[PDB]
Amino acid sequence: ADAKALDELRKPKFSSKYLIQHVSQKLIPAVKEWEKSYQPPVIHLGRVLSVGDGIARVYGLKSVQAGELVCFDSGVKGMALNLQADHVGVVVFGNDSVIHQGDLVYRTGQIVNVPIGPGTLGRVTDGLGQPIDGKGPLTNVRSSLVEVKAPGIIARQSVREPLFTGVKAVDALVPIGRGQRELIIGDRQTGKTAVAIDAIIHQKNCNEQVPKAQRVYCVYVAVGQKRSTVAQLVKLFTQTGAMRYTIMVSATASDAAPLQFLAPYSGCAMAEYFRDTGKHGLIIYDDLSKQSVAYRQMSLLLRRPPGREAFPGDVFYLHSRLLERAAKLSKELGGGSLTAFPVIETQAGDVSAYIATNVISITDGQIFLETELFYKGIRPALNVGLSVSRVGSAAQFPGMKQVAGTLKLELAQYREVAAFAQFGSDLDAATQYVLERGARLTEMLKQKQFAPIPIERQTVAVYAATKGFLDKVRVQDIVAAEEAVISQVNPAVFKILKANGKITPALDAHLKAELRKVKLPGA
Amino acid sequence: GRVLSVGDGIARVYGLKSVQAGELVCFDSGVKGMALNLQADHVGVVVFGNDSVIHQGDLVYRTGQIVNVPIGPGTLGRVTDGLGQPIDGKGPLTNVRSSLVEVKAPGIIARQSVREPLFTGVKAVDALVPIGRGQRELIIGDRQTGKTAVAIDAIIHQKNCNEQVPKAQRVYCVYVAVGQKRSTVAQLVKLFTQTGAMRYTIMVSATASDAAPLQFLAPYSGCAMAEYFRDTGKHGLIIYDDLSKQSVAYRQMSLLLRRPPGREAFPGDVFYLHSRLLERAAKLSKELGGGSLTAFPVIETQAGDVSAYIATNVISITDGQIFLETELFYKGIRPALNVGLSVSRVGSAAQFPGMKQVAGTLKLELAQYREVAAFAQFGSDLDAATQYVLERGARLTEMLKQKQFAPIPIERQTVAVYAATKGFLDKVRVQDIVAAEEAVISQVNPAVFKILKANGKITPALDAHLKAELRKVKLPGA
Amino acid sequence: DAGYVSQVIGPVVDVRFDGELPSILSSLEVEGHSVRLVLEVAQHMGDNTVRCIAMDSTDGLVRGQKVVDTGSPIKVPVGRGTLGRIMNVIGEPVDEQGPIDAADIWSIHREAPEFTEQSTEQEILVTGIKVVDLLAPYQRGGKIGLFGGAGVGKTVLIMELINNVAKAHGGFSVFAGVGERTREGNDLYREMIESGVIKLGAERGNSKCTLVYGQMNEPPGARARVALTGLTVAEYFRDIEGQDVLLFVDNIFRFTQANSEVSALLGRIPSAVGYQPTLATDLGGLQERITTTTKGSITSVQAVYVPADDLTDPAPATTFAHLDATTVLSRSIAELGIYPAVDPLDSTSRMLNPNVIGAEHYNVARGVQKVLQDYKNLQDIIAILGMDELSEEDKLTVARARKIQRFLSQPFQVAEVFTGTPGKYVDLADTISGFQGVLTGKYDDLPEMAFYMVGDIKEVKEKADKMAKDIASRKEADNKKVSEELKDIPSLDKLVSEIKEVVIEEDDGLEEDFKAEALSSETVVLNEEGKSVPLPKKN
Ligand SMILES: Nc1ncnc2c1ncn2[C@@H]1O[C@H](COP(=O)(O)OP(=O)(O)OP(=O)(O)O)[C@@H](O)[C@H]1O
Ligand SMILES: Nc1ncnc2c1ncn2[C@@H]1O[C@H](COP(=O)(O)OP(=O)(O)OP(=O)(O)O)[C@@H](O)[C@H]1O
Ligand SMILES: Nc1ncnc2c1ncn2[C@@H]1O[C@H](COP(=O)(O)OP(=O)(O)O)[C@@H](O)[C@H]1O
Ligand SMILES: [Mg+2]
Ligand SMILES: [Mg+2]
Ligand SMILES: [Mg+2]
């Protein structure tokens, strides 16, 4: 059984020829009798051994690379994922009902690539590049690999530019930066998509205002969502004019699991064009908790051994190599940027889950949206103690930086007394004074949906709350009092607060002056 | 035999036709291995070292002999690895003898009742969970709660009392360090030489960079080295520090040999592993010599979760349990022995008879103090049958505190516990904690210690003089 | 002579050798790749096949691609030529400044030092952090672990320890970034340019740190070995240069996680929670190489991420045993705004011994832990009663412990860019005496928040003075404040006039550089000859 006699067997030791001479003049006549049942032999092409559940096992394909787009003879694409010794495991980019046993698989030569460029700006795309909005094919566009490595230590520079989202809980408490990956984590129906949408709408509102290179180009990656929701989102974006800067990659729920797995990489390759060419990108991987389930489906059907919650071993790498592409580049590489908003859904608030802890470990900040604050009127349901941000200062508005530290610490004082408000002792007009002051601040931080606020109106409206001008107002109607503050105040203080960037003492005087002239409705 | 596959410290060896289960083999590279699972096509050999020197097709020779360590009096004072070879660098082990590491535990008839006491020098352990010779007592706790402290104080106290007993009743200790760092083993050898404890202490050390079979096999090496002293009518004391690491090394080997896993991926025979180890600690019969071996397994819990797999297994195996809490540890109670959860199934049959008549009050009023434990934090004083037990239990928990690496003789713990259970307490304001805890044992004359040690019991002729001596204690700092 | 690629499943490649199998841990080179693809041999599969882990991505590997053997493990440049450089796992420079001019390249795999060459010297390493230096004092030449969940401040604490120790050390430093963010790798590189710890150009040799980076974007074969590369640079400085080295490892958890990521593809059935069955021995084989021998001294600070704040997860619970000191950062302390969020109870050190740091230091440390544990036990009856029936001793042990909780916080010099307060280095004696004062009761006459984010005990006393002049103020409210207009204030329409003008041309910069190639409407594939041929008309 040991190999040395087994390769000594390749020496001829037949010691008779009454079969070698007989079979040789009998074999080729016998292959002719059944050559109709012989499929033609394959070396460099493929032939499907087995197909099932979206995994083809392909014999042949001698020179395919790992991770390469292969194409079946029925036109449906694939990707050579695990290259076994005897076959190739191809994940099928589409419905595997058109693939049979014995179909030819054609190697396309290229690693998986999507159309990138300025012609993608405004289109609705599936997880591979094909436009699904029916507005023709993509023009003014070139191909690019979906699996580039992230820009290294020398290609990057410090995250300094602010990237307002228009949600003032975010722009005051957990401020994003321009090359920052900020996680939107929460339970279902808490407003994660809503925070991402207000980010994209606010970037449309600010792109029509800045000189040509501070403009942020958005990409929405919609993994696993239903096709109706993507239709609602495209309708909203096109009725607000935000679809001019937005690409939408849409690998919906009926799509094959490799398209949902690959659509964050397709969307990141589309948004990396703006990072690599000196512009500024922004990407939302909405339901990144569904890309991991599609990857788990692919890896369990390729018979890779499961792990925690039957996820693969390399499901941390799946998201780390995706999110690390969101960077702020150096001036020697254009100064471009790409800021990511991955969305992770928890189950019953269990943030201790597997994919949740992986993406929390990768991304810079968190935007925790808790379902118990969503039903107390706090919308966006931002848990202030649990939502962190890595950049902190140096990447937000300077005028908001003057007025937001005294909000962040004062809400810590307000949460400090909530576990001591069930008895009613009301110690020495301190634990009862901040019990209304912080309650007025949390009412200041509420806002509506699909209506982002410019940053100067937010840093006026939170100037009006952490300073005076609002303590004589009931907690019930500060959401009403803020429109009195925003509208009735002269709209020329907003321009000079936007153009300065901070609250100068020349402007602090007029801002405290015009915050006393308006009518607050509280009675 | 020929190596088929090698990787992660497991060599699949084709050949080795008549090899025994658990037998040593030897490779071409000079590394050894133990043939663990013998299959019809190959032998699964775990490798005693780094497997990077083994290639496919390397030759494996069987050594013909099961794994064995040198035992004997030449191992005393030497730091060995998990296979017996000395790593302290003082040359080969003179005056030893090879003997198998997997022996059978002594049966029902070879046992004797565990009656003579093994003093640890920790007065909490000697007063509340008393250890006999031949007992398996689990030192269980969380991380950094003082388990190695209790083990080390038992070893150091065995050195201290080994100088004042005859040749027969001396305890020779073995400390087995499984899975520990190599820098913290050297600090223990430093402490044991500076203490003088290495005159009776063997030190078996399978560190973290050792192979998994060496850490799996080091407790059996240490148990064979201490079974030398058990089987020749002398007394031993074996301490397996982190038996929870020996189980993890065994889990690694059994998973890489593809044995079917059970709860928390442990193999099915991990209870058999630990009970096969811990049933060898026995008090032998009068016919086999009368010797004894006392085991202190150490199991680390995670969040006090003693319902974990290995912790439940060893709690099932051992007689007693010394449960060290982390909340008592930072509250100042060090050694942080949880009194209500620490058991000893041998119990009062194997403690000091002078302590047995004083500690029976102590554990009772400690239990009374534990049930009235919320009232300590109150302003409204209750009916002074609870405030009495509150101040009494507080001074009793402060009685059982003890500094590290300073064990106490049993006659001094008896006197200090007598001075707190009979009512000679510091019922003053407690500014004088500095000059009253040690003042009892330092100001009574040492003749009462000689009488209490030699008689082993507070006689009516001695509690009279002890009560007369306890009243004249000075504390002249006030 | 050479081998060929037999199988590629993600980051694990099977390579088949017709004779001359490599050793385990051998590095192999894949000839013909886009980049330098290094495979490190992990095991011998058995029919003349080895199984390897890739140091780069395996996308592009063809079966039968020629793989050549180097006869040795991954050898990296070590020595003075690496000071002030950034290296890969495999020793490539990633800082765009020439090659690395280091002599006597070393294998990244070696055995740990022996038991005979172990040092037992215990000198305290003064960090300037008053919660570290009081309750869990570090050892110079010791293994230090900064445990903590995500976002509790392990990286800011390791940056403050760099700023406080590595600049004033004399010896060399090695930061080994293991599976971390590339953003903070760049931030570390830039602020060690600005500190002088890394100098570029002609005075490169005056640098004091070698960066070795293996971040999150790298495949799991690279994150599982970059700690060995940083450890090899530190072991050269310890063994050959005879130096005192300072190894800083950011998330040694990523070493075990990256070994776990390839563990099932190497064919091992998983252990408990989901880690490899070789978790303890992999972690031990790394951690035992970080020792001070008799030759030189490696002081290691390791950040250890605990997953989901769970200190009983086996990857932190295994690395607990390898550490002399332990700084458990917790989320609960950080939710009170107290930074560094060091759990004063759950932190432990081997130096916290009255024979080591002195009984005067030991007793104030144990007293702080005693009053903090008593307050931790009293909080549960406070929240039910309300802290007015606490016997005037438990109103004192609450007030002193609540002063101590604030007094353990400290401004950090590297954390003034997102907090604003400049950082205070606190000496050891001014920590011990300052905590002895609040313990015995000299400072009950100061308010409670005066102890928050200060330095010495001389700063809480003057923060109380500033707080009580400021709560003495804000009593005038009538006029001649900033709100009046003829003070210095121009008109509001005048301030709109000084706004400089920026243009908007409404073409947003998309018609200037793009090479718009014409993409194929048809699928174009390769036939058996490899010729690019459109997809044949037959389904
Ligand atoms: N700021 C807000 N004010 C009021 N309502 C809001 C706000 N944000 C979101 N909502 C409402 O909350 C609901 C959930 O919002 P959204 O779909 O963004 O959450 P989600 O977490 O993405 O949900 P899913 O997980 O189902 O996608 C929506 O119906 C929306 O109308
Ligand atoms: N009785 C005591 N008095 C004072 N200090 C003590 C006492 N017991 C333990 N300590 C201290 O507690 C620290 C941890 O103790 P020890 O190592 O004994 O616990 P452990 O449970 O073995 O920890 P690990 O599991 O990490 O080895 C040591 O530094 C020791 O000095
Ligand atoms: N000393 C400190 N002072 C103020 N904030 C801090 C401090 N340490 C940490 N933080 C806050 O914690 C957050 C994360 O810290 P970091 O070191 O990145 O933790 P991790 O290493 O666990 O990711 C930062 O946003 C920072 O604002
Ligand atoms: Mg959603
Ligand atoms: Mg221990
Ligand atoms: Mg970090």
Coordinates of N, CA, C and O in Angstrom, one line a residue, chain A residues 4 27 63 87 99 112 158 177 392 398 455 474 521:
Chain A
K4 N 6.1 3.3 -2.7 CA 7.3 3.0 -3.5 C 7.1 1.8 -4.4 O 7.5 1.8 -5.6
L27 N -10.7 -2.8 -28.4 CA -11.2 -1.7 -27.6 C -11.7 -0.6 -28.4 O -12.9 -0.2 -28.2
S63 N -7.5 25.8 -15.7 CA -6.7 27.0 -15.5 C -7.5 28.1 -14.9 O -7.1 29.3 -15.1
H87 N -12.5 18.9 -8.7 CA -13.5 19.8 -9.3 C -13.4 21.2 -8.8 O -12.5 21.5 -8.1
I99 N -29.2 25.4 -15.1 CA -28.0 24.6 -15.2 C -28.3 23.2 -15.0 O -29.1 22.8 -14.1
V112 N -13.8 38.9 -10.6 CA -15.2 39.5 -10.5 C -15.1 41.0 -10.5 O -14.3 41.5 -9.6
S158 N -5.3 61.9 8.3 CA -6.1 62.0 9.5 C -7.5 62.5 9.1 O -7.7 63.3 8.3
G177 N -16.8 61.6 10.8 CA -15.8 62.3 10.0 C -15.8 61.8 8.6 O -16.7 61.0 8.1
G392 N -14.2 61.8 17.8 CA -14.6 62.8 18.8 C -14.6 64.2 18.2 O -15.5 64.6 17.4
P398 N -16.9 73.4 14.2 CA -16.3 74.1 15.4 C -17.3 74.8 16.2 O -17.2 74.8 17.4
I455 N -26.3 72.4 9.3 CA -25.6 72.3 10.5 C -25.6 73.6 11.3 O -25.6 73.6 12.5
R474 N -42.1 74.6 28.8 CA -42.5 73.3 29.2 C -41.8 72.2 28.3 O -41.4 72.5 27.2
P521 N -43.9 79.6 22.4 CA -45.3 79.3 22.6 C -45.7 78.7 23.9 O -46.9 78.5 24.1

